[PDB]
Amino acid sequence: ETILEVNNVPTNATSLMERLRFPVSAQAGKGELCAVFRADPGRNGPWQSTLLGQLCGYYTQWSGSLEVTFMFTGSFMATGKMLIAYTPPGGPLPKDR
Amino acid sequence: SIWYQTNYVVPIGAPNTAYIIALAAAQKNFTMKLCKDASDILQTGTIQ
Amino acid sequence: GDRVADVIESSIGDSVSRALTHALPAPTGQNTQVSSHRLDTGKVPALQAAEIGASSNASDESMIETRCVLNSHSTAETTLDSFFSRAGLVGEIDLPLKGTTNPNGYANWDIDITGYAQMRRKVELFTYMRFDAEFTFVACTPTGEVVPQLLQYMFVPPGAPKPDSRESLAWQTATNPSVFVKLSDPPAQVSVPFMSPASAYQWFYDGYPTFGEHKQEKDLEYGACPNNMMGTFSVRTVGTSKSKYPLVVRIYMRMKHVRAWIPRPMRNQNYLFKANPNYAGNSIKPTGASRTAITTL
Amino acid sequence: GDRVADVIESSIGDSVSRALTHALPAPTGQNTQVSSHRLDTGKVPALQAAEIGASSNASDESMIETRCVLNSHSTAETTLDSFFSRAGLVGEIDLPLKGTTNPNGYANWDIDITGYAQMRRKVELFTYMRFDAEFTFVACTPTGEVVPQLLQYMFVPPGAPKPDSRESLAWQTATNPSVFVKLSDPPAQVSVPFMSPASAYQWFYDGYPTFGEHKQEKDLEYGACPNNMMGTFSVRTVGTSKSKYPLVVRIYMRMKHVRAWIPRPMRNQNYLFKANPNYAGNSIKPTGASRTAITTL
Amino acid sequence: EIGASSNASDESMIETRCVLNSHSTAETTLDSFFSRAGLVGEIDLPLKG
Amino acid sequence: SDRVAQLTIGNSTITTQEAANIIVGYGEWPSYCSDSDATAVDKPTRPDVSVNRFYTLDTKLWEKSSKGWYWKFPDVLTETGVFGQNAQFHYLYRSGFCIHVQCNASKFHQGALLVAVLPEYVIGTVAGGTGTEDTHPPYKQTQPGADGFELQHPYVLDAGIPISQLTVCPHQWINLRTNNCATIIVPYINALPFDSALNHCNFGLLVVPISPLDYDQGATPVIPITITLAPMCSEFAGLRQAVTQ
Amino acid sequence: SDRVAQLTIGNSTITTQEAANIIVGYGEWPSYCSDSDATAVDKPTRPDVSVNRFYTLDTKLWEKSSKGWYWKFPDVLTETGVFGQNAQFHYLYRSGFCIHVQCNASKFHQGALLVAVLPEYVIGTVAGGTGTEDTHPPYKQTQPGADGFELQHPYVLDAGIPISQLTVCPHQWINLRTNNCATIIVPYINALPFDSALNHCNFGLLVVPISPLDYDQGATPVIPITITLAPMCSEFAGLRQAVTQ
Numbered sequence A: 001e002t003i004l005e006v007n008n009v010p011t012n013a014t015s016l017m018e019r020l021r022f023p024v025s026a027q028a029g030k031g032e033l034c035a036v037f038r039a040d041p042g043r044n045g046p047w048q049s050t051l052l053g054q055l056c057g058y059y060t061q062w063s064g065s066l067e068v069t070f071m072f073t074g075s076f077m078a079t080g081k082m083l084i085a086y087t088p089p090g091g092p093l094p095k096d097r
Numbered sequence B: 001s002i003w004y005q006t007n008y009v010v011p012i013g014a015p016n017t018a019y020i021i022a023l024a025a026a027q028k029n030f031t032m033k034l035c036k037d038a039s040d041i042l043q044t045g046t047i048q
Numbered sequence C, D: 001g002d003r004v005a006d007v008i009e010s011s012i013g014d015s016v017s018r019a020l021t022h023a024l025p026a027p028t029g030q031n032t033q034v035s036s037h038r039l040d041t042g043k044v045p046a047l048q049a050a051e052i053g054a055s056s057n058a059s060d061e062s063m064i065e066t067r068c069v070l071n072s073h074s075t076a077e078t079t080l081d082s083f084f085s086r087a088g089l090v091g092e093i094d095l096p097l098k099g100t101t102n103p104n105g106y107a108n109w110d111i112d113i114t115g116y117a118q119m120r121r122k123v124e125l126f127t128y129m130r131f132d133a134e135f136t137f138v139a140c141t142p143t144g145e146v147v148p149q150l151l152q153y154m155f156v157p158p159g160a161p162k163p164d165s166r167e168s169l170a171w172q173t174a175t176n177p178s179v180f181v182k183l184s185d186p187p188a189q190v191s192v193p194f195m196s197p198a199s200a201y202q203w204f205y206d207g208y209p210t211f212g213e214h215k216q217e218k219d220l221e222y223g224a225c226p227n228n229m230m231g232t233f234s235v236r237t238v239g240t241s242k243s244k245y246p247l248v249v250r251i252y253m254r255m256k257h258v259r260a261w262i263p264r265p266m267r268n269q270n271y272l273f274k275a276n277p278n279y280a281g282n283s284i285k286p287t288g289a290s291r292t293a294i295t296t297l
Numbered sequence E: 001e002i003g004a005s006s007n008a009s010d011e012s013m014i015e016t017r018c019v020l021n022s023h024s025t026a027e028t029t030l031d032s033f034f035s036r037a038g039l040v041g042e043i044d045l046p047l048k049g
Numbered sequence F, G: 001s002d003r004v005a006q007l008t009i010g011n012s013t014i015t016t017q018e019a020a021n022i023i024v025g026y027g028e029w030p031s032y033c034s035d036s037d038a039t040a041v042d043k044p045t046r047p048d049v050s051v052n053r054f055y056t057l058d059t060k061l062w063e064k065s066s067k068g069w070y071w072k073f074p075d076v077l078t079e080t081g082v083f084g085q086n087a088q089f090h091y092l093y094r095s096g097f098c099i100h101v102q103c104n105a106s107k108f109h110q111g112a113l114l115v116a117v118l119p120e121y122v123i124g125t126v127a128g129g130t131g132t133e134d135t136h137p138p139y140k141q142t143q144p145g146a147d148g149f150e151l152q153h154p155y156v157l158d159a160g161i162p163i164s165q166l167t168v169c170p171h172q173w174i175n176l177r178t179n180n181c182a183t184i185i186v187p188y189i190n191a192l193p194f195d196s197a198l199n200h201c202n203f204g205l206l207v208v209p210i211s212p213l214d215y216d217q218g219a220t221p222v223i224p225i226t227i228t229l230a231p232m233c234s235e236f237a238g239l240r241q242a243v244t245q
């Protein structure tokens, strides 16, 4: 496993390390959206920061299941439940949860 | 896509914002085929 | 566990595709057996019922008195490999000097063999085809002349950087396969495996490649299936200065180790485009020659 | 046949309802075993975790030093049959002379035992109940007097003609069961089987009996389930002229051969209607007695 | 934090069917990856330069 | 080892690191209807994975003044996913359920929710206040759909019965200082082998705060309660056109 | 004993007293995808009876001037019954089909329809008439839905190929003096184990009059052709929300 840049938005040199992680914080309980990204490993985007995506770049075709492990780095007193979903082909970006 | 199932709850004295780090890799049924050059070529002029 | 009867006695799940027919060996044509006059009531070979959808099973022996004929005529020349493993033109690349198309010394050829009628009509007899192939590259000037020029051919699979110039960094070819050869040398020749992500290429794909509303703008993608798009073939004169001579590369393909499924009616109208079966509507011609009357030759 | 692995190893279809617990015999209350002082670390019976949803498993022996007690107290009187097989009032039918309700000599009683609190509260402890029953009919004048009158009781199942008068042709009772008895005779008494189309009657049906839009008008049918509607009980004085005396028939029911499923919280607000659990909103009372403070008796 | 990759597999995260995977892993060996000739040097021998 | 758990069914997986075991209603697991109990003759359809999976239907906010809510099964899923479609196209339906109510807070919040399952949960009205009006609850109240419905008078569960005795039904508690979820497996409960998923709600799910939520100014005040559930051993029969009610 | 038949599958039964045997495309019966050919890992859903049944989708009128029509599979069912729902909720789909085209007349009518199945039936345009315009057929024409679409130029099957050679495909004829229906069983045909029921039409059904309908003034002039079909061994995988295209 290598770090996936889900937060690939900032681009100025001083803020590059920020791409390495996304935030979560107290919401208003409406099952709000936290983040989204394509699962395509050999496509431009987040996966480009991973060794998998890079090596994948040397092969025309690939086949297999992928996995993403999310690590929470908040304080020990913080708690929470998240819903992470993978939407197979054909499904548009989910409107709501 | 990631959604808040419930909510990020914290007591008095703890930060209202924390971060998540995502690590990814392939499962053991993963394989690749047909070697090709990568789309990037990290060089603009000649390398001295 | 399973306890309810309908589940135990279920067929849900058998992967065994039960087949009604099997192949028998047939190196030669069938022999003819002696036959005599039959004047029977009840037996009637001549009468058929084409509505069923099967071809007539009536044979020579039952329609006329035949002699015995030991037929040793071979059926070898009609196998798929015999029919297809003959190299034919499938692409041409031009590398002119002061022209319009490629005055830069290089050229990118989209790997698609549907630009030539002969070869195309043959493969389109089947819907799905799986095979390896031998490609031969013949190069010379437009007059069929041979000159001392060094060329580089490179296979650029989907996702690899397409050369944008005669000096593009992509020609470093560190991973893609490239071939360096002189026009003086004999035609370059290589073997190519079955590269599709599918179990077979298909000359016809009645569908769209992606989801969404299929509005007018995107109607060009109807019938386009990525499993058939193997990549780009790039060629360039090997130098930093323009070549002194104009060139032409003819690409020949010879299929080998062929398998095909689902026969189709054979094309009977002139071809117009690579990507589709479009035909000239104001010019629909019959499949063959015509005559003045049904009662005269 | 089944060949694909997921189908072979499937559980789709097992009708065997695997149970976590089974019943053991218990004719008497549990005995108490001798116990001594335990001063252990690790073992801790007193501590529980009610969140789990199970009752405390702590026993007398582990909470205090106990003596041995051979308990032979019977548990027989708390079986469903012991609890329910006691006849109670479930219906009253009035047959007055010059009144408003039934001045015609007959009466139709919709077979519903939910008109009396005592009996009702008992059966409503369970959701589903299956049983046979013994019905007893006590008749007399309004003063509890006995007179020489002949009566006819008839069970009219759903679909049979309900008598519309003391002289209705329906009293021919050629197929329905009828009982003829005098007020002087002892109370008529018969056995009734479990007649529902369902495996059990149910005192609660959270649903509607039919499809369609469930607009305001039809909201009276919410909770009404035909499987609980066994029919009509009709009674009449047996004659072509008005009876000389006013009558009252009290109907008593005694369940027997009882089975029940799914216990429920017991009713704690006065009953208002037969068909529903409606309660008086401006009069919600606590379940029991109250006191001035939590620290005083 | 331990420093090892996740050991969670398809079978334990969702109900899966049986799949006999015969996809080869031969093309990703070091020799397959590297034994492809590429440009590593250029030497110029000009006249009047 | 009892506080940690994983529920996987279909293409869905749930995790919890603060559970309090699992309750199996009336002590028995869901199971398909046997050939002895069955009565309808047509061969049923058992979609399996496409319908027996975790559906996360609704989220409510717990407040210092919340009264409690209820949802009805199978009413909650009748318009959701492949399960809903089957419920609509078929006259007959039967299934069990795995219910997982979620609610986490902090080690500084307090409060306790009673999560229970009540078969044949018939609703009553306050009868005009005086008890002289024979009112009846409207469709929107008896079958509230996925949004559930808030209880008017919790003490009597809006049906003239004491909530104090609701524990006689399969249940668990979500005591914030102990666990952040309740899990209850429920088998098909009815006096018939199959029934209409539309006209009949086999049971109701009740989530009621018995010990009010509380915390100090400054702690996250938004405490959601999310309802996730999965049908089990779903069976359908009596196919025809789709009907919503 | 070959002119009489009964097809029963699901809760549907078809009868015919003037059949002409049954064709089993390319000589093989539909079958579920084996664990060797399969590639996707999720456990599929096989609804069975709720989707593998006879759906009667459309009726056309045969006229002395009709040209012929075509329908596409599985396009025809994508919006019908439980089958349609599964096709929409799942990314992957595969199935076979039993097709039964019906058309009866009288012993005084005459005419012959060719009923065939053509895998990967790609449609072409007349290219502006002169062949200089690179036009493409619109969505409504490539995937006509249940209504089918009328052929513009039958002789070339609107795709530059001779209909005279269409008999090289699984087919039957409906010759009014002989039979009043055609029945063709078709196995899943594709170069992949499963595929999208939405973006890809595995094959097309063609019903074309080769010998024109005819009769005398006074005989019933309304001669319908009805299309009934049933999926076989339907399998679906890759569940998600419902998508229509």
Ligand SMILES: CCO/N=C/c1ccc(OCC[C@@H](C)CCN2CCN(c3ccncc3)C2=O)cc1
Residues within 6 Å of the ligand: C111, C112, C113, C114, C133, C135, C153, C154, C155, C177, C178, C179, C190, C192, C201, C202, C203, C204, C228, C229, C230, C233, C274
């Ligand atoms: C060192 C460079 O040498 N490489 C030579 C080379 C030659 C051919 C190469 O790939 C040839 C692939 C063709 C056999 C595929 C032809 N097909 C597959 C099906 N298809 C197609 C076209 C249009 N519509 C549907 C299908 C095609 O055109 C790759 C490299």
Ligand SMILES: CCO/N=C/c1ccc(OCC[C@@H](C)CCN2CCN(c3ccncc3)C2=O)cc1
Residues within 6 Å of the ligand: D111, D112, D113, D114, D133, D135, D153, D154, D155, D177, D178, D179, D190, D192, D201, D202, D203, D204, D228, D229, D230, D233, D274
């Ligand atoms: C010769 C005539 O003698 N017949 C006497 C008789 C007596 C009783 C008869 O049927 C008694 C059926 C009751 C035991 C059913 C009571 N139940 C079943 C469940 N139920 C109910 C009522 C309201 N809401 C839900 C359920 C009822 O009221 C029939 C005939």
Ligand SMILES: [Cl-]
Residues within 6 Å of the ligand: F079, F080, F081, F082, G241, G242
């Ligand atoms: Cl949905």
Ligand SMILES: [Cl-]
Residues within 6 Å of the ligand: F241, F242, G079, G080, G081, G082
């Ligand atoms: Cl429909």
